[PDB]
Structure formats: structure tokens, C-alpha cells
Symmetry: D3
Subunit: 306 residues, 6 copies
């Protein structure tokens, strides 16, 4: 049977990330909205077809889940696990609801955000609002190509969607968000050769540096994990730059979907806390996490039925 | 004598950047103005011909006197505060304006980054607004915005300084105002009422006929005719912006004209009223929180320092 | 599955509706054309790909079915039922074949229509020919967004395609057509608030009116029907405006596909005859039906092989 | 230079030609519409920028000019001159006003036509209404590329716009329209080689046949006219196919702009009456003119001031 | 189980065909490249999305297969069979690897070909390099629409991909290539009506000639085969024109994918050797084959190891 | 004005450069072709509008000019000047005619080249044929953005077109071509910082290096010349990469247009021979010229009239 949310969206060039908390007594207003969210996507999005590609993914946090539903909980659902590393600190910030809104135009995102928060004023409190845009040729603020090794098609369905291991909630996924702020001054002080040492790929051509040469504290080194299974462990990311030139804010908004947060959380450990042969991900010497939240993004039919 | 890209094509994205010049920044600023033309190309060229990146640089009255000596543009002065019976148009600080436009936001942002990069230390940001086209050229009130702007030769004649101030021919006078709307209240009106506020039909964007159109409608108060009986026109490129988190919904107003007298007449009519109208009804749902006037020189004036 | 005809087309912006009757002796010429119709679709369409999105769906009436084939009939196939209501009359007009031709450009529709009518010169008599065009924001002639609540993906497959319940004809569907003409003068006499009360959605933003404000005689009210389960019964529509400014004709050409006509026919009863709560669909006070025909659109396999 | 109407439109893929006559007493209503016509173009067309390319060219006939205006007449303006040839007849049909409406989508045309006829209902009577569409590679109904040898840029400005030779009306132009209906059955009976002989260019590649192979009764031969000047005389054409497959109507709607009708009228004489070396244009053996009108399309400034 | 290579690519307008042989001792350098070829496709292609539509399909010859791997062989894999017909000769030329590289722009093909040949310098020897371009309305060098009756969606999956009949290599396909050169002078000597008799469809409208009037020596006649069960036998083609104006070379590069080569090879026998009804395909009277090679294009997983 | 050839073309992604010499007795066949070349451009190109952007610019060498025409010669027309530098050599190769064919798709270039070489079979001998392609972000074979500082609009008119100084040939221009091959192995051996020192701009962001830090042997340094007039001397370039991976050929085809060749030739002297402060342009340490030819590209009117 079950239809999931538009987690596997195509490439989109605009996004709004909205994270909010439920005030006391808001729970009823929110449950009403969750049943209608699908129909607002269509109201706003239908008229702009087919260029629009407007998609909203709604996610719910661990404490918010217990306030909203009783019954079963998704297996992997918990608050974000703060990581207090030797050097770098992955923080945990409040967040009950996520709207990850994507389209080919910002206005569509904004229109949907308007209608959603319109129904929710009274009942929630905004914690974070980010307007994200694609930079050139799928590049991020650091000037590297961002998204290349994401899984596609069949391999994406397999790495992202809950299946038979938690059959109650098949079609759902686990999203982790974290807002990063970069130290561009520092970063642009590096030679390109040295930047490529940090990331693990070539800047201009976006080719992976060979085993012969790729540092073990490079980002691509530390985020490549193999299972016990011997097969690679993959997640799906849709990192979006944001910023303001006035307030020297240059950002990467990280969002990572996985069929189980164990995967996402492992990559994070390796980045913040280190391996045997690496102190921490070099990327963090130019990037500070200022948020961190985890959510479960149910199947679409789950929300329909409220 | 070639002008700045004041007559840009339709673009879907913009950054408005307004700064003041710190004491001793005058030198760093003069350097940037000479190079601004060439940064436009650097950033923009590789995205052609979709890109449509354009930057227009404008200079305030007080800043002009700090940066150059010699003759001044005839019309250049600080934005005039309007203390109306009900509505007040404020004046906010602003030495430099960058009006950056393109078909993608990232192009605007990359140019804004490179400009503010050369000015970090010399200036202090007063205002930064990221604007976007809503839908089918609608604004935050739901009406089509731009329809009666002049085009081609009529725009050339309405926006560019000519023989009347020959020293500065190719320049223009930009007025900016950030407006915030009380959407709460606006969506409280029927559509028929909203049309009476604006002066056009919402969905079809046809003018209301002169026999039904109120004298306090926005379109009424912003149609001015001269002594010679011909229309007095400006060029606008209003951009919506906002934040749903802080229930901020806005229209960023920018209006270019060959003399500020024109732009300023429309404003007086809006804030202070006519015989037959207390004030523009659009202000009962829109608050001005900025106001600055700039002169946007011919391009050769900037190149040559 | 069997491969079905292109009933699930994307959004296309142009269409030709061609309805014909079969003359005496034309049976043979028609059978030949049905076998080749698939391959004419490709001839005409292939060189314009993928911008083109040319699709033709062919359907066959009740009486024509018996002239053309022997063997089983589709379970639901019958003449359109005239509905003689208190006020409004849904009429039944003759039609043996339907060609529902759709593309992103009118000329492609016209080239294929030319080739089809070219092979049927002698054999048939045209009853109806409409050239339709989508308004630029998916609006119809009344000014409302038209198609918003159509099913997509798996839900559409389930709503429109014959399955196991008549396994002989799996992949087929049941198309109902009606040409409507509108009294625009009257319609533009209403406030927008009133027009929204007729339709049941907001004009500009295309959001459903809330359950507590939506009239029982609104179009959206009378066309939402619930099944045995209490789950919604859906059809797939691709209404197209048409008209002529010279002869003050402004129209909406209605076409609805469903896996069984009982569904489409229920919606019609509710619209024309009324419920306890509602005299008739208020949309009919501004729209007159001047045609009405029912067709079965077979699986594509069924045409290929005879 | 004074501002002209949008005669020099880019390539556009849709059009509506509307021809009407002014009933008596209607002259006031028509003067009103002419002043506002410019601003209706923008009302409808603004919101669709920049894809829209909506443009309306308004033209006025000889008799209607005298009923409508104040003072002096455009030099070249007169009723269309019937041409009673040995074989073929170029007929003259009634027509006081022309709206030549063009865009990249048919709906935009229709919207503007609606708004225009809205202001005129009562005051005029429709004579002819054609909905035209380009084939996908600039082909006409005969299957040949159509538009190739039109002038561009400076050469077009010079060959179309009235200048100092009639300085009251500089910026205007002279349009000739004629609706043609083709005999497709006949035409498709020819070999391609023979079709090429009729037109004077190659069907597939659209290359001009070499000087010693191109018949003198070919269309391209008879419509190439040299001045006293020794230089070529040029017009600007935007021929649009139209038709109905039901009613076996296949058409080409001819519209031709020139700075003086002398040029257009010369091509017509050559076509219908013959030269020294040719009876008549072979294309007319497959094409019947069923209308014919001439109009003057003033400068835009002229219309604004009424 | 398996993800296949991008054999079912969308319509693309540019291609590079690259055919090489493996030098002695190159086996190792080649094996490394095959494991990484997937990830080079993404490197080069990702930043061009979604316009780019860059795809590479890699295939391996019969003799090369035995050099590179031990273990099972694909059931159908063998050297291209020469066909010495009464009149026309289908030749067999050397070729160990195939890269069938496709995109919307030529430069993307070229950047990937650069990266591939970069890792293979020293290990291989180029046999053939062709830069192809589709004409703007899907026509080929003879002026006819080329691709029309290719299978799509599920029917293509069924016609092209190895399934349960050799489950070891499911997801694979069999590619046959032939470079053809045309005698354009001769071809353009025909009336269109005659050309249609060679091909079996209408030139301009691309409609099949009716069964009664279509010659049995037309190209479409000889390449329609039915199986024993009476359902039609299909392949997937992506013919690309190429040439050089300077050296009067005008060509069609033929590539055909099928779930077994028996199918492709049958069509060839009919073309070169004839049926009862037909001496040979008339298209060969204007087209000469100057290459001929057969490859197995494995499932993508098989390369990743 | 007179109309010039399409020297000021928009951005195009594909090109064919064809250079030929005229055989004994070819002069007549060539004169015929030149009169028709404008009209072949339109034949081939018109049906592909507006995406096509097909343009062909035809140029004629010094010795060829005297075979083909008598009467005046263009002031600046002469054989390409060999420059035998201390280190690097700018060579002269033969060329009577140049066809500089540009469009958005290669096939359009090829179709026009085919039609042209078709009419010249027998009469000419090909000296060079190059199929060029722009990389997707306007980069060239060295990885840098190429075209940035080319003049546009009115400043280009002023830099490229012969005017009043040789009024007989106003509308013409002077094209110089050179085929370059690069030693990519060597080039990719540099750090990016070093490559930027060769070119004079930033690789990634395409920003000029500041006057304080830009080497005097950088390419941008040596090719900025100022006139007697005090203002900069500009040319118009449309460099195109080409190559073959089989024969390890990676190339840049150089073409430069100017209103007089003295401008183009000065830049070349500076590149190959050096200044006081520079031995030679560093770009030549990675690029070898293997052709060199100079042509005059006449006004379009000049060709039409033969
Ligand atoms: C500042 C935050 C980040 C930035 C700017 C960033 C940027 C990038 C870049 C440039 C790449 C290389 C291109 C690609 O393969 O997509 C990459 C790869 C990757 N990133 Fe990140 N990243 C960030 C954070 C994260 C985080 C927090 C995670 C995981 C929790 C993550 C997981 C991955 C993975 C798995 C890969 C691919 C591994 C493979 O080569 O097989 N990234 N990221
Ligand atoms: C406060 C937010 C504003 C909004 C949302 C707004 C919106 C609009 C709209 C919808 C129109 C009709 C469509 C069009 O002609 O563009 C319009 C017309 C106009 N507006 Fe505004 N406007 C604003 C502020 C201003 C200001 C401050 C000025 C001048 C100082 C101005 C000057 C004009 C002019 C000159 C016209 C056209 C008059 C004509 O139709 O002949 N607007 N505006
Ligand atoms: C049924 C009506 C017509 C059809 C189907 C038609 C079709 C064509 C075609 C295929 C061409 C060649 C391609 C081109 O240059 O556009 C052409 C050229 C032309 N037609 Fe027509 N045409 C028609 C009527 C007319 C009429 C009524 C006129 C003038 C009164 C006209 C004037 C021309 C001119 C001037 C040319 C090009 C001259 C040159 O090649 O230098 N056509 N027409
Ligand atoms: C050999 C291969 C060549 C390559 C790869 C090449 C590449 C470039 C690049 C990357 C730029 C900087 C961006 C730009 O402004 O376009 C440039 C600028 C330029 N090149 Fe070249 N070029 C080559 C040969 C030549 C030759 C032979 C000439 C002149 C004969 C020339 C004249 C210029 C000029 C005049 C400029 C810009 C001057 C200014 O910045 O004010 N180039 N070229």
C-alpha cells in the first residue's frame, strides 16, 4: 500500500526550513493542520505546474510525538544527541515540528509557509526560519559541488524509507537538521590545494582524490562508512546555502534523511569525536553548528488520517 | 554618455543594500565605485544570457559632499520627511545604495558579497533586503505590480537626466522606501473593496473606469499630469520580501525619475492628500519604515576616478 | 499490468476533442484505424519529443461496440443516461468514437487529428470538434483553478483503470464527455465571495472553503462522494476551456475518466437532480450541457492486436 | 521617430485575427476603445511576462476612417481592389476594424479578444474570426517553410513603416489580409518534386531552387518584384495556418504589412492576372481567397490621443 | 536485485563513441577504471543537472572478457560475426572496450571522455572515436526521422535487459556497433518518393507506408522480425550522425542494444544476405559499414566490484 | 547605415571554422556562392528559430581578394604577418576563404557547412576544419572563463566595424584566426594560484587580479593596450575549444575581430616578442600556434550584389 512524503524530491533551487515548538494546548490546532498539510501543498502548488515542483515534508520531534499521539512510536525516534567533542561541539536545540519546503521558485515556498503558519499562529512558536537558495552549479558557500554522491532511484528508496523492520511506519524517514555558519575569511585564506585536502575532492572538477592521497581527516573520508554488512551506508542530503552579506552570515543548512538515525548519528560521531587516525573532520575548523534537531517524517497517509 | 542599468529587463530576484560611510572610509568607497562596473561583469558573465545581473549604485546627498567636490546634481537632497494628518513618511540614513537584480538570487548574493567584501571596515550596513517575484508579478497585497510602468523610449525620457542638468546627463534619481503591510486587516476586506483601494481589478488587472474609480485610490493619487497636460511618469520595480516567522510581509519600493520633483509630488499626494482625498488608502495597510533618496550617476562618471 | 492508453497524461495546454459516428459499412475502415492509431500517435509525436507530450486516447460507445466486436462487453458500458432534472437537464447526444488528443502545442493535436480523420473519410460523420486551450494559470473559463484535487500516482491508477473486477478489459477506463456553455454575463455579475460559494474554493488562492462555511449546493460539496468504506470516490478530469469571441461562446469541455461509470454517474445525479440538502449544483445556473456521451477506452493491447 | 504599433513582433506561435464592421451610431464606442486598446494589451499581457509576447495591432479600413476621424487621410488608404483574373478571383470583403492579436499561447490572445469585444458588443458586427497556430517548424498547411525570406531589423523598419513620405502618419503601416482555403486532396496528389516547382523552394531543406530550374509561374518567382530603383521590394508576412478537421477546412490566413499598399498590390496583380511569361501563380490552383480587406495600422501615439 | 547501466537514457542530442583495445599488461589499469567509471559519470555530470543528462555506458568485448575476468561468461557474448553477402559485406573490426557517452551538450561528453582516457593512458590503444550530433528534429544524415519505433518504458526493459535466462548477469545488455558512411551524392539523386521506398516510411510526416505498398526490400520491412510465438522482436537504437565537410565524410553511427545478440544478428542477416523476397536492404546501396563490434554492457553493480 | 555580417553574435555554444583555398579557375564558382551565402544562412536557420541562433560570417584573404574583385581594396588587408619571437613563433598558413559558423547546436553549423561546401566542390581545397564547443560555464580548455572583457553594445560597434575611415567598406571587419594546441599535462601541473598568475584573473570567481599583484607577463597584462586616444584598444574574440581524446589534442581556436588589424597585430607582437617588462605572454608556454591567417569580412550588402 503506502505513499511516503516527497522526501525523494528532484533537484530544487529554493527552500524554506521552518522549525517551531508547540506551545501548551496547541496540540489540537496542530493535529488539524497535519491532516490538511497535503491539501495546502496542492492548493498553492497546483497552479504553478509543472515547473513548480513545490513539495512540503513535515517532520515531528520526539517529545512532540508523545504530546500529539499515543500508540506506537517509531523505533529510532529520540531527541537529538548532543556531541561534546574534544574541540567541536554539535549542539541540540529545541524543535517539535519541521517543515522542509522546496520548489523551483522561492515565492511558492513562501506562499505555502504563509498558509501553514497562518493556521498555526496561536499554537506554535517559530524557532528557526531559513530561506535557502542554490549557488551557481550546485555549489555551497565553501565553493565545492554539494550533493554529488547522493543515492538515486532504487538505492535511495532503500537507504531512506522505513520498511519491514518497523512495519507500522513504513514510508517514513528520519531527518536530522543542523544550521552551520562558516568562517569564510579563514577558508578563503587557503590555497585551493589545501581546501581540497579538507573536503576530499577537487574544487573545480569535483573528482574524488585517490586513496593514494586523500587525508583521513577529510570530510569525505569521515562520512564514508561501511556496515558490518560490508556494503556502504548511505544518506540523502539536500544542503542549502543561506546568508546575509550585511551581518557577515554565510551558511550551509544541513538536512539528512535516513531510514534509521543510527546511520546519520554515526557519521556525526566520526566528524565531531574522531576515529583512531583522525581528530575531527577538518570541515569543522570553518563551520560551527548552531542548531541540531531530529525528526520523524511519517508516510503521507499517516497524516491524512486525523 | 552611457547610463547605469536603470532600465533593466524583468528580473525575478533582488538585493537592496543600503549603507553609511564610516569616517575615513571615503577612500575605500571611491576605489569600489570605479571597480563596481567590472565586478558586475566578473560575477555575471559566466551565467549569461539567463543571468540578467545588473547593479545600480546610488549616492546620498550628504555622502556626495564627502566624496566629491565641485558641482552637484541639481535635484540631490535628503529625503523629505512627510508629517501628514494620519500617515508619516520617515527618512532613514543611507549614504550608498546598491540595487542588485538578476534572474537568480545567488547572482545577486555573489555580487553583494564581493562588494561588501571591498567595503568591510569602511561602511556600516543600515538595510539589507532580499526580494522575490510572487507568482505572476503580484505583490504582497495580491495585485499585479508594474503594469503601467513606461517602457522603451518613454522610459528613457522619464528617468534619465538630460539637457536640464547637462553635467550629469545619464544619471537618475532613485527613491527607496521599505513598506510593511498589515495583512491581518487587508484580508479583512472584500475583493470589491480592495479594488477600490488600489484602483484596478484584482484578478484581471484592468483599470477601473473613471466613473467608478475613487479619488482616494492609489492609482488615482499617483496619476499626475503636468502644466503641458502630458503624464508625469516614474519607473518602479517593487519587490516583495518577508519572513513568515515574524509575520513580516513587505513591499520594497523603488522609484526612478529624471528629477525627484516628480517622485516627491506623488508622495505628497499620498501622505498629505488632495482637495478630494485625505490620503492614499493604500497607507491604511502599509507602513513606511525607511526613506532615502539617491542619485544614480551615468556609468562613465564612476569608471573615471 | 496490460499497458493502458495515455489516460494518465501530464498537464498539457492544448487539446482536440473529436466525436464521430460510424456510417453504415464503415465498420471495416474503423477496425483498421484502431489497430494503427497507436503508431500514428508515435509518427506525428516522435519528432517533437520531449516538449511535445502528444497523446491520443481512443474510446468506443455502447452501440458502436456491438457493431465492431463480438465477444464480451465491458461490464459498465452503456449509453449515456439522460437526466431530466427539476431545473437542469443533462442531455445525451450521439457518439460512436472519441479521440481525446492532447499535447503542449495545438498543431500537434491538429496533425494527428488530420491523419486520423484522413483514414476515416467515407466511414464516419463528425458530431463534435472542439479545440481547447488551458488558461495560463490552469484556470477555466469561470476564473477558477481547475484540476487541483485530481488524484496522482498510485491513487490515480486505482481510480481510473479497470482491474480484477472485469479482468477481460483490465487497463481500460470509462470516459464521460459533456460540452458546457457558460453565461459569463451572469457570472461576472456576482461578487467574488459569491462565486466562491458556488464553487466551494477561494478564487485567487484556490484553498478549500472550511467545512463550516461551504454550502451544500456548492460544486465541490456535491461532487465529493464517499464509498462503502467511507473513503472518497475519485475521478480524473482534464477540463479544457474553448470558445469563440465573435459568437459570444465561452465554454468548458468536461471529460472524466473512472474505473466504473457508476462513480461519474453518481456525481451527475447529485449535480442535476439534487440531494435532500441541495436542489442542484449551483454551477449549473451558469453552465448548460449541450452534449453528453459515454465511452470505454480500452487497454492499448486490445487495439494493437486486431 | 514616433512610436509604432507592434508590427515587428518576434516569432509567435499563436494568433487571433478578428475582423468587424461598425454598425451606425457605434462610432463613439469605437473611438473609446481605440484610445484604451494600448492599455488592455498591457492589462492582459503584463502578468505573463516575459514568455507572453502578447501584442495587438489595430487596423482601420477606408470607409471606416472617414466615419471616425477629424482630418486628413493616410495617402495609400482605399478599399481593397477586387482582381477579376482570367482564372482566379481575389475577392473584396467587408471590414472596418482589424485586430491582429499574437502571443506564444492561444489563451492570451483569447483573453484580449474577449476584453476588446467586451467594450464593443453592441457597436460592431463580427465578419471573420480565425484562430491560428504555427506548425512546429514554421511550416504552413501545404507543408513548406513559411517566413524564410521576410526582412529583419533595419530592412524591415524601412520596408514596413510609413516615414517622411506621409509625415502626419509616420509609424503606421498598411495591412492586407486574405483568408485562403486549400485543396489538400489535390495538393497531396503531387510529387514533392512538382510541389517544389509550384513554390520555388525545396520542401525538406527550404533552399531556393537555382535560377535556371525555378519556373516563372512559381510563387517565389512572381512575388519577387524589383522597383524602378533596381532594388527588391519587400513586405512583411505572418501567415498562420488554421482549420477544422471535421469540416475538411485547411487554411492559410495571409497578412502582409508594407509602408505603401502599392507593393502588396503589385504582388497580387502578378499572382492573379499574370506577367509576360506566366498565366498566374501556380499556388492559386490549390488555394482560394475567401476574404480580402485592406487596413491602415496607425502609430501607437495616434490611437492614445482620442 | 540489480541496478543496470543507463542504457534507457532520455533523448540526448550529443554523443561520443569511444572504442579501444587493451594493450598487453593493461588489464590492471582497466579493472581500476571500470570500478570508478560510475563515480566519474557523477563528478562531471552532477554540477550540470538537470539540463546535462550525462550518461556513460561501458561495454566489454568477447576476447577482452576472458583477459579481465574469470568465472562465468554472459551466455550470448561472442565476437562480431562477419557477414559476406552476395553484394554487401558487414565487417568485423577490433574492439575490447566501448564507452557510449551521451548528453545534451558535447562538452560534457568530452569532459568525461577526457577523464576516462586520462586514467587509461598507456594501457589501451584507441580504435575509433566519433563525435555525434542529432539533427534538430530527430532526423539522421539521410533526412529521415530516426528513433520513431523504438520501444519505451516497460517494453524496452523487456527487450533490452538480461533477465532470469542468465541470472548471473541480469541488468546487462548486448550492444552492437557499426560505423556507416553514406554516398550522399547518390542518395540526394533520388526523388523523395523513391527514398521513402528505400526506408519504408514517409519522409516529411514519418508515417509508415501501408502493408500493400511497402516494398519487401525496404529497411523497415527487413528489420521487422516476429518471434516463433508471433509477437514482434524489438531492439533499442540510438543512431547518431557524424561527419566532416572538408573530407566529404557523412555518416550514421549505429548502436543497437538487445537482451540477446541473436536478435540484432538476425536483423543483420536479413539486411546483408537477403530473404526469399529481397536480395538485401536497399539502405545498403547508400551506406557502407566500415566497423562492426559486439559488446556486453554489464549491470552497474558488477563494475562497482 | 549599411548592414554588416553577424560579427556581433549572441552567446553561442557551437561552431564550425572552415578555411579553404581557391583552386585554379574557381573564382567564378566562389563569386556565385558569396552572393547566395546570406540566403543559405536563412534557409537552414529560419526553421530552427528562435533557439537556433545560426550565423555565418564569411571572410576573404589578401591574395584571394585580388583574384575575385578589382576596384578598391580594404585599407588594412594584407597577409598574416609571421612573428618569429625569441622563444615562440606565430605562424602563417594559407587561407583564401573563412566561414565562421556559429549556433546553439552543432548540427545547425554542420548543415550550413554542408550546403556551402556543396556549392564549392571542385573549386576549393580545405585547409582547416574545426568543430568547436563552449564548456558549460563559458570556460575554455584551460579551465578559465573566456569572453568576460569583450566589449558589448555600442562600444563593440565602435571597436569592430569599419566606419568613415575607409567608407567604401564600412560594415566590414578584420578577422584573424589562429589554431592553438595546449600541453594540458604541463598546465595541470601548476597550482591554481600559479595558473591565475599566467592568466591574470581568478580561476573560480573570474575576478581581475589587482594592479599591485598582476604579473607583467600575464595574458591580461600584455593584451590590455591603450591608444594614442588614452582610451583602451578593444577587439572582439570568440575563442572556442576543440579536440580529440584519441589523439591527445586539446585546443583553443582563436578568432579576433577588429575595425583595423593594427589593433589585433599589436596584441600579438606583445604576446610573441615581449615588452620592456616581459619576455613573452606566459600563456604561450602552454599553447602552440599551428595556424595563422587574416581575412576581411565585408559588409553584408557587398556580398549580396555580385
Ligand atoms: C557544513 C556542513 C557540510 C558541508 C558544507 C558539506 C559539504 C559537502 C561536500 C562539499 C561534499 C562533497 C560532495 C558530495 O559527495 O556531495 C559532502 C559529502 C558528504 N557529506 Fe557533507 N557537508 C556538510 C555536512 C555534512 C554532515 C553534517 C554530514 C553527515 C551528517 C555530511 C555527510 C556527507 C556524506 C555521506 C558525503 C558523501 C560520502 C562519499 O563520498 O561516498 N555532510 N559534503
Ligand atoms: C506601498 C506599497 C505599494 C504598492 C503595493 C504599490 C502597488 C501598486 C500597484 C498594484 C499599482 C497598479 C499596477 C501598476 O500600475 O503598477 C501601482 C501603481 C502605481 N504606483 Fe504604486 N505601490 C506602492 C507604493 C508606491 C509609491 C510610494 C509610489 C510613488 C511614490 C507608487 C507609484 C505608483 C505609480 C506612479 C503607479 C501607476 C499610475 C498609473 O496607473 O497611471 N507606488 N502601485
Ligand atoms: C495561400 C497563400 C500563401 C501561401 C500558402 C504562401 C506560402 C509561401 C511560401 C512557402 C513562401 C516561401 C518561403 C518564404 O520566403 O516565406 C512564400 C514566399 C513569399 N510569399 Fe507567399 N504564400 C501565400 C500567399 C502570399 C501572398 C498573398 C503574398 C503577397 C501578396 C505572398 C508573398 C510572398 C513573398 C513576397 C514571398 C517571398 C519573396 C522572396 O522569396 O524574395 N504570399 N509564400
Ligand atoms: C591561446 C589561447 C587563448 C586563450 C586560452 C585565451 C584566454 C583568455 C582569457 C581566459 C581571458 C580573460 C577573460 C576574458 O577577458 O576573456 C582572455 C582575455 C583576453 N585575451 Fe585571450 N586567450 C587566448 C589567446 C589570445 C590571443 C592570441 C589574443 C590576441 C591576439 C587574445 C586577446 C585577449 C584579450 C584582448 C583579452 C582581454 C583584455 C582585457 O582584459 O582588457 N587572447 N583570454
Amino acid at each position: 500500500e503506502p505513499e511516503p512524503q516527497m522526501v525523494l524530491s528532484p533537484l530544487t533551487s529554493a527552500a524554506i526550513f521552518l522549525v517551531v515548538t508547540i506551545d501548551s494546548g496547541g496540540e489540537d490546532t496542530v493535529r488539524d493542520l497535519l491532516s490538511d498539510v497535503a491539501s495546502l501543498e496542492r492548493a498553492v502548488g497546483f497552479r504553478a505546474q509543472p515547473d513548480g515542483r513545490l513539495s512540503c515534508v513535515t517532520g515531528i520531534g520526539s517529545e512532540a510525538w508523545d504530546r500529539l499521539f499515543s500508540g506506537a512510536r517509531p523505533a529510532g525516534l529520540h531527541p537529538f544527541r548532543e556531541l561534546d567533542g574534544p574541540v567541536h561541539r554539535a549542539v541540540a536545540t529545541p524543535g517539535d515540528l519541521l517543515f522542509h519546503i522546496r520548489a523551483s521558485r522561492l515565492d511558492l515556498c513562501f506562499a505555502l509557509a504563509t498558509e501553514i503558519m497562518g493556521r498555526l499562529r496561536g499554537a506554535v512558536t517559530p524557532q528557526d526560519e531559513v530561506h535557502g537558495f542554490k549557488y551557481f552549479d550546485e555549489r555551497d558557500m565553501l565553493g565545492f559541488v554539494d550533493g554529488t554522491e547522493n543515492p538515486t532511484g532504487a538505492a535511495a528508496r532503500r537507504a531512506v524509507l522505513v520498511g519491514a523492520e518497523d512495519p507500522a511506519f513504513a514510508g517514513g524517514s528520519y531527518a536530522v537538521v543542523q544550521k552551520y555558519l562558516h568562517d569564510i575569511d579563514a577558508w578563503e585564506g587557503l590555497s585551493v590545494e589545501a581546501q581540497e585536502r579538507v573536503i576530499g575532492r577537487r574544487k573545480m572538477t569535483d573528482v574524488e582524490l585517490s586513496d593514494d592521497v586523500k587525508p583521513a581527516d577529510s570530510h569525505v573520508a569521515l562520512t564514508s562508512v561501511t556496515g558490518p554488512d560490508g556494503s556502504d551506508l548511505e544518506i540523502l542530503r539536500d544542503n542549502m546555502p543561506f546568508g546575509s552579506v550585511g551581518r557577515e552570515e554565510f551558511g550551509t543548512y544541513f538536512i539528512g534523511y535516513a531510514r534509521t538515525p543510527e546511520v546519520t548519528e554515526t557519521m556525526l560521531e566520526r566528524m565531531f569525536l574522531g576515529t583512531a587516525s583522525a581528530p575531527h573532520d577538518r570541515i569543522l575548523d570553518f563551520s560551527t553548528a548552531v542548531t541540531g534537531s531530529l525528526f520523524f517524517t511519517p508516510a503521507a497517509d499517516f497524516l491524512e488520517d486525523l
